[PDB]
Design a protein around this nucleic acid. Structure first.
Lengths: 195, 49, 110, 48
DNA sequence: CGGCAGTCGCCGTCTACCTCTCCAAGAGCAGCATGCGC
DNA sequence: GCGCATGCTGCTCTTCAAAGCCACGGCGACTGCCG
RNA sequence: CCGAAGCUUCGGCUUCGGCAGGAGAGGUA
């Protein structure tokens, strides 16, 4: 398996980080198997599939809503029935007030579960729409999900084999003239970083 | 302290009714510390005569 | 309940298995850990008829261990006389990553 | 330091050419990287 | 966004010569070797 | 007399754990932090 | 490279034999 020379990464400064435009902590995390990075992203296939993916996502959206209302109707069924059959026969409805608060928190339990699911889908979509190369992504869960659903169009991994790919797919001239353009018309500290 | 750590760790892997104080105690760490102090140390110095 | 991985030194897989199975009860937690499996297979070889079957552990140095997750189970299955760590710790080792259903099944199905 | 590098490399090769799960292979690759780093400059990162 | 100041890591700190001592240990795996049984 | 099982000695590894102990000046990135 | 032993035509030839790294403490100018 490929490895990385210590002289060009743990120095002052980090020459590898200066070449790849990555913070040294990010390099340390990627190299020693603690985070992922996105090597490439096929944007043409993420353009001629947009509204189709949006329609499948709305299908799952509606299916999650259908699930929610299904078990909300059946929970309100059980509730209504039992509560109206035994609405504190004789005494004060302190039992139906305990299960009033408990049933409102049961409705909000399934409601926050459907909210959680809505958030999962929202973030998955956002990330799959804001996926540029050389972007570090942590949390194995999310990665695995993105690689299951939208497996293709996006490629990436961790370790020095994933830094060899970043170095191989590197264009010296474009970055060089970009830095010269920044130095030509710029001030502040971005000019110092370019220098 | 090293010997105490060893006996604490080994007291939970042996079977009861065959545990005696002589089977829980290791002498090697203590003699190692003593012979390491009296030899390669900066304060036990070769005497000048 | 998931299947995790543990990293012993070298040659101490069966002694870590024994010490762990003893400390399951001797310590005081019979409902946390459940099953310890040291992956093992065979090796075709003979000495003019007399067999040997070299103990070729299919994963030299690791011991899968079915376990739940708390704050005393981690303690017991990390101070065992032999284990070195909880292989899988990707990020301050704050919650070991469990083995994936598939791979766990195809390893056990050997 | 050479013996350590060779041992880790041999173990990694045998585990890769066996069909091992990803976690174990990743652990071995990290350990090989650390051994080579200690060969070239011992003490620069972590403990000697 | 935009300055900003503490902070944290890495670099360096004279030359030449003499004498002595100390420098992995515990655990585990075969390769036969022999006693005993039918 | 032959076949089974279990014990002498060379002989070759093996090393993640974790508490321990706590100048001085110069230079340069950097990094959370306040506005 | 040195030693021992043979051939030696006196240029030499042959046999055998043989090694030297770290850490700490004290001192003299």
């Amino acid at each position: 398996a490929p490895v990385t020379h210590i002289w060009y990464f743990k120095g002052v400064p980090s020459r590898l980080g200066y070449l790849l435009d990555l913070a040294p902590k990010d390099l340390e995390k990627i190299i020693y198997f603690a985070a992922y990075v996105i090597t490439s992203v096929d944007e043409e296939m993420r353009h001629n599939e947009l509204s189709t993916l949006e329609a499948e996502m709305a299908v799952e959206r509606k299916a999650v809503e259908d699930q929610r209302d299904g078990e909300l109707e059946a929970r309100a069924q059980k509730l209504e029935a039992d509560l109206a059959e035994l609405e504190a026969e004789g005494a004060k409805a302190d039992a139906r007030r305990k299960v009033r608060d408990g049933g409102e928190r049961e409705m909000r339990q399934i409601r926050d579960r459907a909210q959680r699911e809505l958030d999962r889908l929202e973030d998955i979509w956002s990330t799959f729409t804001k996926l540029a190369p050389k972007q570090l992504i942590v949390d194995e869960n999310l990665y695995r999900e993105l690689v299951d659903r939208y497996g293709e169009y996006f490629t990436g991994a961790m370790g020095a084999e994933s830094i060899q790919k970043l170095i191989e797919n590197f264009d010296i001239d474009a970055e060089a003239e970009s830095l010269r353009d920044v130095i030509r018309n710029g001030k502040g500290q971005k000019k110092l970083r370019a220098l | 302290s090293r010997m105490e750590r060893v006996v604490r760790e080994r007291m939970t892997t042996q079977d009861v009714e065959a545990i005696t104080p002589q089977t829980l105690i290791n002498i090697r760490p203590v003699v190692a510390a003593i012979k390491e102090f009296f030899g390669t140390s900066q304060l036990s110095q070769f005497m000048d005569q | 309940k998931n299947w995790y991985v543990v990293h012993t030194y070298s040659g101490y897989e069966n002694k870590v298995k024994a010490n762990l199975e003893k400390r399951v009860e001797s310590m005081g937690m019979q409902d946390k850990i459940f099953r310890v499996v040291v992956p093992e297979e065979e090796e075709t070889d003979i000495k003019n008829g007399k067999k040997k079957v070299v103990k070729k552990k299919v994963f030299p140095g690791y011991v899968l261990v079915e376990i739940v997750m708390t704050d005393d189970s981690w303690y017991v299955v990390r101070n065992t006389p032999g284990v070195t760590g909880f292989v899988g710790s990707a990020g301050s080792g704050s919650k070991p990553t469990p083995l994936l259903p598939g791979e766990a099944e195809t390893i056990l199905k050997r | 330091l050479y013996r350590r590098v060779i041992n880790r490399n041999n173990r990694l090769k045998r585990l890769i050419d066996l069909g091992a799960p990803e976690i174990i292979v990743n652990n071995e690759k990290r350990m090989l990287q650390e051994s080579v780093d200690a060969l070239f400059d011992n003490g620069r990162r972590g403990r000697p």
